[PDB]
């Protein structure tokens, strides 16, 4: 019961936080896949371990769940999804709702015909310290 | 203390004696008045971890 | 199954009337009917509730009786029975 | 009778004390009630029978059961100083419908009136109209009331009878000697439908 | 935390009551053989079985 | 009947009422205690007979009135007192 | 008659043949040390429907098996061997083995 | 089948839980069993409302006990009351076996299953009801075809999915070869609580009661005498104790706990007796007066 | 028939819960029409242990209290089944779901007495009556009052308390999601009980006075016992004396205060100088 809740919660933080920003990401990633392959654990525990995997890794290492909205009140589709998610014990299909929380993280500047380009913005970080999460 | 309600239930715990260890990966323990019992090796012991005439906790 | 036993003594206390030892604890696991004290051949003693239909009063000290293994009742009486030395 | 649950009313009255039904009408009613149980079963066996005394502060003696033995145990104690209260027995059959054996069965009351009615006529004619909608009808066996006065009971039955799926009838058996056997005349074979 | 501590006081009693049942009879009599630790100890009973037993806090 | 607050009686009251001498009343009072109309002790030197207890008596006209009066005094005290008991010791009161 | 007998018989059937014992030492009312006849000596309680004076040491008492509490007082008891010895006596002579002596 | 058999997380009410514990307890070692009345909603929610019991025997659970006559008989009573309940499953108590389902218990569960497809099997431990921990489990049978193709984790889906370990030994081994065990939740209601919490009219005056001086005096005498003995210890103790860590001070002053703490414990016990007496003493006199 | 084998009536928590639960089950009546059901429990004892209760469908009207339905047939059939459960379970009496007794209850009582060997009418209430007992137990008695009333059948109270069984008691704790601030085992619980005590006394005390008024006018028949008992309460009165507490609690507590303070006094210089060096170290250490 503690294991299932702790492990899901970890997954929510780790999205777009990488192996070269905490060792924790290495430990967590490895642990997910180990559970599915093995039968060592009790089945109750595995349900939590496997959902937590999809969240951490999500979207090909491209998507994040936001803190808030663009200003003010907490992002509107995101909060709901999570509320219903936490209850999954009585009914398994409730876990699906976590797709709604995922929003792609791109800051977008545009051309004067108003369609996606590859324009640049400056961000002060080091490429030795942030990079997209390494797969399982 | 609340948790202690649940913790105290078992099927008891004894002090036994290892007559001999066996190289079959099972160990022979004889409880003090009651006959011999063969039980498997645990995680907490193997056969280099229990050697003849060792009184043990069970 | 039934064990073999001897009668040590006769107490009796009537069919679930007792000395009023009945509390708010069970009266199917405390109260005894008309009862007989028996010393058994195992080399134990059991104070036991005998069958309500054929009472404890009928069985006197000295009888060799069967008793129920599970919950002790004296079902019936068995003649003089012991060993092969005694048979001769 | 046929998929019907019935409550049977036995009289308590001073009029029971008469020798007209031998030896006495109080004891005679025991024979009568067993005729009512046996007749209903004969027609179809799928029905239940009960017995109520209207004695004192009205007590259900026994509720719906197919067993004649249960009814008969209860009938021997009776108040021979009491009096029949027609109105209250109907009320006891109403309560019975919510929780009874044979919940899904039809509703009928077969009542003996061995003595004149006590409960005001106007109240009872009016009561019938309510009763028609719920679908319980009262069949009255009359030999006590007729001697003294004209059948008041007739009015009750007339209004009552509509669509219910069960009917009602006024059956008259004579006030003189006819013993318990007169019960044969009753709607315990003479009954009809409302629908 | 203040009101919480008061709450926790009531839990201690509740708990004490529940455990108490376990604590009483059936009770076998041993002799106090030796101490392995001061949380688990060894006591030797009167049918001859030696036991590895936990010490229940309700004594010293 | 008359005292809620006290339960002791003087001898002199009986004495005048009866119009019977003082010497007799002390002796009469002793018989009273022996029958069991009253239980208590008698203190001669204080000139009181103190009742620890009064015998039940079948419904009387004076009686019914006193009981009501004493119940009223009692209700009122219990409400006043309830406020004191509740008012103090705040931290255990939950 | 059979109804009363059988109902009382069900109560005998659910009820076991409880452990008989003896009072080794009565420390207090609530803790009595017993020597049970199965072997292991036990700490038992008492029910309040009993007088502790009767139960005191060297006296046989009944023990429970469902709870390990002293059920009741049993009077002191003697073995079947002692019964054979208590029964026998006859074949007697009036007074003298031999007269004049 | 793996394609429609899921486990049944059982919501057990006060009326069922208490009934089962009591019935097993009195019978011991005679074992008791019965049918459980409840309602079934979801494809996995069973509320166990109430139970009645089947014939006890000295061999316990058997085929002979289970007859359709008892059940059929009950159902007629259910109509008459106007209670609706369908049968949720069956119960038994094993004092004479562990939580593992005995060879006669499986036979009995198969018959009961034919009547209600969704059937639950419950081990009660009457013996454990004497102590302050009670261990009882509910289970559901698993089909032979289901194991091979599906495997036992298929029962775990679309429900709570807690799988129980009731120690090691026979109990666990028998579990694995036989059935899937599923969890217990308790149903409760506010009204249900309120009944339980209720005490006595008499307790109202109990607190008020003026504790006898006599009894108080016994307590007072008892408290001052222990205090004097300890007082000495307290006196030697204060000469040292320049260091923190109070447990070390306990070994030094000798024994478990500080002698300062021993004196306080006694002062406090007296304080509690005193508190009821003095409060009560004024309080009583004023209020009746 | 006897009503004998009672001097005390203890009632289980099971009994109450069964009546509220059973109300929904039958019909969702909810005390719209009062229910009488069987009261089940032990026998061959002086004390009465009411182990259990089951409802019988009984509707009594609210037009009239003299008309009721009571389902007899259920009682005989339920009889044989009780032995399957345990052989200590037999019909002891009956239950009334309240809110109060009637004169009508004597008549309900005569029918139930045939089955029982020790009939008692115990009013278990569907609403809990206060924080006190939610149950009152009564027994049918033939008595005269010197109020000029000849022979009546009425209900006189017999002492009620709440008991429990070993199996049941454990089960109750687990079920409970309350923790109990009214346990009454200790000083903390005991102080709450005293506050409540005063409130309890007041609730009880009012009734006694209204009863006295009814006799006076608003004519009500006098139950002689009640009047006899009332007068007794007022006569015992004395006045208060002493009781006080010592300065001792403080002394111990102060002792603890000295010890720590002495340890503190040596430590101070060390601890306070070092702080500045460690503080600087921490900020730099944190970054990596």
From Swiss-Prot, chain A:
PC repeats: 5-45, 48-80
N6-acetyllysine found at: 39
Family indicated by similarity: Belongs to the proteasome subunit S1 family.
Subunit structure and binding partners: Component of the 19S proteasome regulatory particle complex. The 26S proteasome consists of a 20S core particle (CP) and two 19S regulatory subunits (RP). The regulatory particle is made of a lid composed of 9 subunits, a base containing 6 ATPases and few additional components including PSMD1. Interacts with ADRM1. Interacts with ZFAND1.
Function according to Swiss-Prot or TrEMBL: Component of the 26S proteasome, a multiprotein complex involved in the ATP-dependent degradation of ubiquitinated proteins. This complex plays a key role in the maintenance of protein homeostasis by removing misfolded or damaged proteins, which could impair cellular functions, and by removing proteins whose functions are no longer required. Therefore, the proteasome participates in numerous cellular processes, including cell cycle progression, apoptosis, or DNA damage repair.
Protein name per the record: 26S proteasome non-ATPase regulatory subunit 1
Name of the gene encoding the protein in the UniProt record: Psmd1
Parent sequence residues shown: 682 to 817 of 953
From Swiss-Prot, chain B:
The protein's assembly and partners: Component of the 19S proteasome regulatory particle complex. The 26S proteasome consists of a 20S core particle (CP) and two 19S regulatory subunits (RP). The regulatory particle is made of a lid composed of 9 subunits, a base containing 6 ATPases including PSMC5 and few additional components. Component of a complex with USP49 and RUVBL1. Interacts with PRPF19. Interacts with TRIM5. Interacts with NDC80. Interacts with PAAF1. Interacts, in vitro, with the thyroid hormone receptor (in a thyroid hormone T3-dependent manner) and with retinoid X receptor (RXR). Interacts with ERCC6.
Compartments it resides in: Cytoplasm; Nucleus
Function of the molecule: Component of the 26S proteasome, a multiprotein complex involved in the ATP-dependent degradation of ubiquitinated proteins. This complex plays a key role in the maintenance of protein homeostasis by removing misfolded or damaged proteins, which could impair cellular functions, and by removing proteins whose functions are no longer required. Therefore, the proteasome participates in numerous cellular processes, including cell cycle progression, apoptosis, or DNA damage repair.
Family named by the database record: Belongs to the AAA ATPase family.
Domain of life: Eukaryota
Protein name, as recorded: 26S proteasome regulatory subunit 8
Curated annotation (Swiss-Prot), chain E:
Superkingdom to which the source organism belongs: Eukaryota
Membrane-spanning ranges: none
Subcellular location, record wording: Cytoplasm; Nucleus
Protein family membership: Belongs to the AAA ATPase family.
Quaternary structure and interacting proteins, as annotated: Component of the 19S proteasome regulatory particle complex. The 26S proteasome consists of a 20S core particle (CP) and two 19S regulatory subunits (RP). The regulatory particle is made of a lid composed of 9 subunits, a base containing 6 ATPases including PSMC4 and few additional components. Interacts with NR1I3. Interacts with PAAF1. Interacts with TRIM5. Interacts with ZFAND1.
Functional note: Component of the 26S proteasome, a multiprotein complex involved in the ATP-dependent degradation of ubiquitinated proteins. This complex plays a key role in the maintenance of protein homeostasis by removing misfolded or damaged proteins, which could impair cellular functions, and by removing proteins whose functions are no longer required. Therefore, the proteasome participates in numerous cellular processes, including cell cycle progression, apoptosis, or DNA damage repair.
Name by which UniProt lists this protein: 26S proteasome regulatory subunit 6B
Source species of the chain: Rattus norvegicus (Rat)
Residue numbers of the full-length protein present here: 61 to 120 of 418
Curated annotation (Swiss-Prot), chain F:
Alphabetical keyword list: Acetylation, Proteasome
N6-acetyllysine modifications at: 16
KW Iron-sulfur (keyword) present: no
GO cellular component, one term: proteasome accessory complex
Single GO biological process annotation from the record: ubiquitin-dependent protein catabolic process
Source superkingdom: Eukaryota
GO molecular function, one term: structural molecule activity
Family that this chain belongs to: Belongs to the proteasome subunit S11 family.
Function: Component of the 26S proteasome, a multiprotein complex involved in the ATP-dependent degradation of ubiquitinated proteins. This complex plays a key role in the maintenance of protein homeostasis by removing misfolded or damaged proteins, which could impair cellular functions, and by removing proteins whose functions are no longer required. Therefore, the proteasome participates in numerous cellular processes, including cell cycle progression, apoptosis, or DNA damage repair.
Subunit structure: Component of the 19S proteasome regulatory particle complex. The 26S proteasome consists of a 20S core particle (CP) and two 19S regulatory subunits (RP). The regulatory particle is made of a lid composed of 9 subunits including PSMD13, a base containing 6 ATPases and few additional components.
Name this protein carries in UniProt: 26S proteasome non-ATPase regulatory subunit 13
Shown residues within the full chain: 283 to 376 of 376
